[PDB]
Design a protein around this ligand. Structure first.
Ligand code: MG
Ligand code: MG
Ligand code: MG
Lengths: 318, 106, 67, 206, 143, 141, 223
RNA sequence: UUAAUUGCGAUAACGAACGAGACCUUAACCUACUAAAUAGGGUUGCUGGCACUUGCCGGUUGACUCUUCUUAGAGGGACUAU
């Protein structure tokens, strides 16, 4: 239960529609970008004062269609955005100019992810294909793993110094999530588990505990480094996003009903975040697409369909 | 021993647009394989040829009118090349319906 | 006068029958799914079908519907 | 207060009448409030406009036409008759002239005067032709705000046009006079007279 | 800073030009002035009789300054318009052919207009200077 | 090398390329400045966007417009649109985004098209009619 | 040689039309259907399709050569610059023009009209078209003009699935008692059509779903 | 209800077809793609006109790169969306 509770300390809004994803760099907590269905990207610089926690610092007339998956480099200078328009754009954040268009995909690019060295980008599209790009703009590797639809791709950082392999995880629609390495250059394992169909796979801040989310009502977490099945945590609703804490061992889950908070090691069902809206009956209630922390571990951002980002500041009760 | 740059225009005119496009693509591919400096498949104002007519053979009904139109597609493909290479290219590079025409010289 | 035609409605119904999972409420994803699974010789028609499917999905959240 | 200058030179007067106040053609759009209950919103004001001309589409749905500026409406109505079809520029010029004339006339906000005129000439209850067999019997009926407003707008313009045929008194002046008559309700203008007649007709069926 | 030439509100510039011409007395009058309709779509010549041709010349010069290679036909087209055709609707017929030519010749003589290659007319350098001076004067009048 | 954008302005058939660079504060149209334009009455329309955000947002940004198509009114409107776009574009690119958002808000609460382009174009004037819809004259007499 | 491009194209079209007409007239016995002009530098290929290809050919260079000569005479070009090939049409049943010609031939020789139409329809169906229609307008016993519609399957009358889908053939048939007119519209099957869309634009067909088994323990499968 | 035998429902009818729709060309949106001394726009040569200081305004196919506008091509985009 604890004493540190979640209270809203600001609502951020600038996008004129759905916000599909948001991300923060490991180096800089101040800059958190936000990608929208409104063809656009808006970077937030964080100031903490009163209500305006983060104001628009760099907006972009980026892609033509939807900025659907956004991943920024660990340093915070290359911002790589994906789209349904089959392309991916690399962004210089301080200036506000594009660098390289990664043109190769036959369908809509559903996931972008950046390497630990910020060099070997990896993209997956609704195609059956998972391409590997360079920051220059070169196709390196076309991964054929999933027999149906690929949706999410995430990279796990490594500590125990440098064993060789670079660890990737890819969500599917065949009911099998796949594990990749880049150097044994390809497959590591097949992590079967999900009952419904997979949405969001989120790895641990250490880079081993990867939670896979679905539509059924249970999150299935895996231990990647030792190649084993960890636990199945309860959710009840359809899951849209996951957010692992840099602060402690918290998991924050975006569900169909609202937001549900859990922990990694201790099987607890802590707090439910459900904000108040204008109008609405019951089933119409807007639920967040994607949610992300920062690096401080004090703040949570959640991109709602209703345009909203909601800054929950985790602070002590007494 | 030769290699004297003339700069050669290729005309691509026709009606059936798809075929024309295919031809253009083929030409560009061929240029790539022979590796030359070239300006692209430059497109001109696709001229419509309108002929509007009384639908009636004989002028006894309501005044129905039909615009019979002819879509035309004019394409310039500019090559920085000698003549021999152009000749080589134009040995094949002909597909039915589409007009292949070589202007030659700058 | 934007009443969806018989055909579109029928197609939507068929889609719902055969693929009630993989119809994620919002338009865009659903549209793409429709394009993938159902073979439509058009684009506008496909879009219309997608829209109708989304509507059906919305309805089916708030109870059971006839057929 | 404070004339900030640029490379391309703008005259001083224009600079003076710019940022500090959300103005009109040259003077205040601000103030000018509806004296009469009802007809507010449906006689525009509210949203500040700087010219009496927009491309702004309004004939799109229904109640959108009752969000079009009053000056603009007047100008549009002026465009009646074939010799004057289109030619919004001319109409706007006429309106400007009318406004100037109103300003000249014992000071006061010209916009306010215009509003008053619009209010006054609008008929309250009007007869509509009812069948009831065959004979042209009329039964009197309440008139919706928007329709009233429209009628009022029409009437003044009609009066002006009537005046303007064979007259040194250029249309603008006539329009101004009409407005004055409406505002200072003396029943000497066309519009007011017509309204009165309509009311009489209604009475003779009520 | 910079003294501008295009930035003059049209008519004032023309007036200034006319005044300058009047002051100089150097133009050489066409001779067919006032005994002419000037436009093919005219029932009246210029209203003020003497002058107005000067204004026309000034306007022509301004147009020349604005553009590149400009000729007689274009000038004619410019100074044409709508014909009162009675029962028949209006057409578009151009200005008087010789008068414009004469004006151009006069300008050339003074040194405002120079002959351009490819086909047309441009501005002489002395002429350009004069134009600039006129513009400056106009600005002074305004300021 | 200068921070600059090239913006279009579009109404009916009128198109207006405004070029937004950085300098003293020059706003020109076809060589002549922003003042003249000369339908004369419609002058204040082109002044509107400038007025909205103020003279302050121009002492830095220079605007140079080239306009084709349309007539006079349409051309004016196009120019206006172009100018509105240009400033916004500049703000989006180089200046802070808050300012841009504020500008947008100002424009959208006063939406005389501007950042939203004009919608209508003429219906084609089909046969049996002197106009688009307007027919000749049926005469059952 | 050489005019305005548009003009040139127009002229070419006109030439093609003329040629088609000539072939309809000249090669009537030969069972002609379509012309396929290919204009290249020097050698202009002219492909001609017919039912009775042998007749067109002659006895090695008979009629075809004559036709070539005629063409040359018509349009100023020399010997060798125009080449003519006669080919078998890939199933005449889908081809409307050929069918129309056949019908005309049947009429002219002396046969039952209605029965002939039915036979034609049957043949078309056998060939593999989605449907077809024959219309026979004129005097079919008695003075008053009678239309006679005969059909099989669907017949799409409206939409762009006509210029892409239905081969139409109109012919006049000359008779001693009065002129007949035979119209024939043929519904080619979407799949075999190849050019344009491969199915009818209104139609939507969805595939069968594939079964997946959930749970069965999460488990780990390693390499 | 619909522009519609357009649909929902009631219902010895059920599921169908043509016609309406869909389709097709065009008109609209793309500061994302494809390229343009036959569409354009930039920086500097040569100089033309100035204010006379750096800066303006030009013309000139000089050179260079871009493609917003122009053009089409490929797609996308609105489904009454929320
Ligand atoms: Mg007249
Ligand atoms: Mg149909
Ligand atoms: Mg139709």
């Amino acid at each position: 239960s604890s004493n540190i509770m979640l209270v809203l300390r600001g609502t951020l809004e600038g996008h004129n529609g759905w916000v599909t994803s948001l991300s923060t760099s490991a180096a800089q907590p101040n800059l958190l970008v936000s990608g929208s269905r409104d063809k656009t990207l808006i970077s937030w610089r964080l100031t903490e004062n009163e209500q305006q926690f983060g104001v628009p610092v760099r907006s972009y007339k980026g892609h033509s269609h939807i900025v659907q998956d956004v991943v920024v480099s660990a340093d915070g200078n290359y911002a790589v955005s994906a789209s349904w328009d089959k392309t991916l754009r690399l962004w210089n954040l301080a200036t506000g100019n594009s660098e390289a268009r990664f043109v190769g995909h036959t369908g809509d690019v559903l996931s972008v992810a950046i390497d630990a060295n910020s060099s070997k980008i990896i993209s997956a599209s609704r195609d059956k294909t998972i391409r590997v790009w360079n920051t220059v703009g070169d196709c390196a590797y076309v991964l054929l793993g999933h027999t149906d639809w690929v949706t999410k791709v995430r990279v796990a950082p490594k500590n125990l110094v440098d064993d060789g392999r670079i660890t990737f995880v890819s969500a599917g629609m065949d009911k099998i999530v796949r594990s990749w390495s880049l150097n044994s250059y390809r497959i590591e394992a097949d992590f079967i588990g999900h009952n419904n169909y997979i949405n969001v796979v989120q790895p641990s801040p250490d880079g081993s505990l990867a939670a896979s989310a679905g539509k059924d009502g249970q999150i299935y977490v895996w231990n990647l480094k030792h190649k084993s099945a960890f636990m199945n945590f309860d959710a009840k609703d359809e899951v849209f996003a996951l957010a692992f804490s840099p602060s402690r061992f918290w998991l924050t889950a975006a569900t169909a009903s609202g937001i549900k908070i859990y922990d990694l090691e201790n099987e607890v069902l802590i707090d439910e975040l459900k904000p108040e809206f204008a109008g609405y009956t019951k089933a119409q209630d807007p639920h967040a697409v994607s949610l992300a922390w920062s690096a401080d571990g004090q703040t949570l951002f959640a991109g709602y369909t209703d345009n909203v980002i909601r800054v929950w500041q985790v602070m002590t009760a007494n | 021993q030769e290699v004297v740059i003339h700069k050669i225009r290729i005309n691509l005119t026709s009606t059936k647009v798809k075929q024309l496009e295919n031809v253009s693509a083929n030409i560009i591919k061929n240029a790539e394989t022979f590796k030359l400096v070239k300006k692209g498949p430059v497109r001109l104002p696709t001229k419509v040829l309108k002929i509007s007519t009384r639908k009636t053979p004989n002028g006894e009904g309501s005044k129905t009118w039909d615009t019979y139109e002819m879509r035309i597609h004019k394409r310039y493909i500019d090559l920085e090349a000698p003549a021999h290479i152009v000749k080589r290219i134009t040995q094949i590079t002909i597909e039915p319906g589409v007009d292949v025409e070589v202007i030659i010289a700058a | 006068g934007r009443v969806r035609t018989k055909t579109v409605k029928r197609a939507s119904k068929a889609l719902i029958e055969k693929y009630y999972p993989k119809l994620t409420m919002d338009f865009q994803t659903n549209k793409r799914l429709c394009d993938e699974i159902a073979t439509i010789q058009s684009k506008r028609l496909r879009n219309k079908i997608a829209g109708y499917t989304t509507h059906l999905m919305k309805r089916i959240q708030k109870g059971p519907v006839r057929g | 207060f404070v004339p900030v200058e640029l490379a391309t030179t703008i005259p001083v007067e224009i600079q003076q009448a710019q940022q500090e106040i959300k103005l009109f053609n040259k003077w205040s759009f601000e103030d000018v409030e509806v004296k009469d209950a009802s007809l507010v919103d449906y006689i525009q004001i509210s949203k500040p406009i700087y010219v009496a001309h927009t491309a702004g589409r309004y004939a799109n749905k229904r109640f959108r036409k009752a969000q079009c500026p009053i000056v603009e409406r007047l100008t549009n109505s002026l465009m009646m008759n074939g010799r004057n079809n289109g030619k919004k520029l001319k109409a706007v010029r006429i309106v400007k002239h009318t406004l100037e004339i109103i300003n000249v006339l014992t000071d006061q906000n010209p916009l306010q005067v215009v509003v008053d005129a619009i209010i006054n000439s609008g008929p309250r209850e009007d007869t509509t032709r009812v069948g009831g067999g065959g004979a042209a019997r009329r039964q009197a009926v309440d008139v919706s705000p928007l329709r009233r407003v429209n009628q009022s707008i029409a009437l003044l313009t009609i009066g002006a046009r009537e005046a303007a045929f064979r007259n040194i008194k250029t249309i603008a002046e006539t329009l101004a006079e009409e407005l004055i008559n409406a505002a200072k309700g003396s029943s000497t203008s066309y519009a007011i007279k017509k309204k009165d007649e309509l009311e009489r007709v209604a009475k003779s069926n009520r | 800073p910079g003294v501008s030439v295009r930035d003059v509100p049209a008519q004032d510039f023309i007036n200034n030009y006319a005044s300058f011409l009047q002051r100089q007395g150097k133009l050489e009058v066409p001779g067919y002035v006032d005994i002419v309709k000037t436009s093919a779509g005219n029932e009246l010549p210029p209203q003020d009789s003497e002058g107005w041709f000067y204004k026309r010349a000034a306007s022509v010069a301004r147009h020349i300054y604005l553009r590149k290679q400009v000729g007689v036909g274009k000038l004619n087209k410019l100074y044409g318009g709508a014909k009162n055709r009675g029962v028949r609707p209006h057409k578009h017929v151009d200005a008087s052919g010789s008068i414009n030519r004469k004006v151009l010749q006069s300008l050339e003589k003074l040194g405002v207009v120079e002959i351009s290659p490819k086909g047309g007319r441009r501005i002489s350098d002395n002429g350009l200077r004069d134009l600039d001076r006129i513009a400056a004067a106009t600005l002074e009048d305004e300021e | 090398t200068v921070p600059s954008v090239q913006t279009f302005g579009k109404k009916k058939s009128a198109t207006a390329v405004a070029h937004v660079k950085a300098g003293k504060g020059l706003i020109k149209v076809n060589g002549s400045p922003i003042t003249l334009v000369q339908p004369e009455i419609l002058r204040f329309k082109v002044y509107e966007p400038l007025l909205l955000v103020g003279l302050d947002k121009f002492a830095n940004i220079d605007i140079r417009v080239k306009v084709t198509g349309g007539g006079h009114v349409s051309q004016v409107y196009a120019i206006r649109q172009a100018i509105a776009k240009g400033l916004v574009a500049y703000h989006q690119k180089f200046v802070d985004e808050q300012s841009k958002n504020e500008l947008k808000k100002a424009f959208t609460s006063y939406d005389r098209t501007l950042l939203i382009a004009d919608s209508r174009r003429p219906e084609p004037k089909k046969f049996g009619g002197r106009g688009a819809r307007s027919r000749f004259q049926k005469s059952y007499r | 040689a050489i005019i305005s491009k548009k003009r040139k194209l127009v002229a070419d079209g006109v030439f093609y039309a003329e040629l088609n007409e000539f072939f309809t007239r000249e090669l009537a016995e030969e069972g002609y259907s379509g012309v396929e002009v290919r204009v290249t530098p020097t050698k202009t290929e002219i492909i001609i399709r017919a039912t009775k290809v042998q007749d067109v050919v002659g006895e090695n260079g008979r009629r075809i050569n004559e036709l070539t000569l005629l063409i040359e005479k018509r349009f100023k070009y020399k010997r060798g610059t125009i080449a003519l090939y006669a080919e078998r049409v890939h199933d005449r049943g889908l081809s409307a023009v050929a069918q129309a010609e056949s019908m005309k031939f049947k009429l002219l020789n002396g046969l039952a009209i209605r029965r002939a139409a039915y036979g034609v329809v049957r043949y078309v169906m056998e060939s593999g078209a989605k449907g077809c229609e024959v219309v026979i307008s004129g005097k079919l016993r008695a003075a008053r003009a009678k239309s006679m519609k005969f059909a099989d399957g669907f017949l799409i009358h409206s939409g762009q699935p006509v210029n892409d889908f239905i081969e139409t053939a109109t012919r006049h048939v000359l008779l001693r008692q009065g002129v007949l007119g035979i119209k024939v519209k043929i519904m080619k099957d979407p799949s075999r059509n190849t050019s344009g869309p491969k199915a009818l634009p209104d139609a939507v067909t969805i595939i069968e779903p594939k079964e997946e088994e959930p749970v069965l323990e999460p488990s780990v499968k390693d390499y």
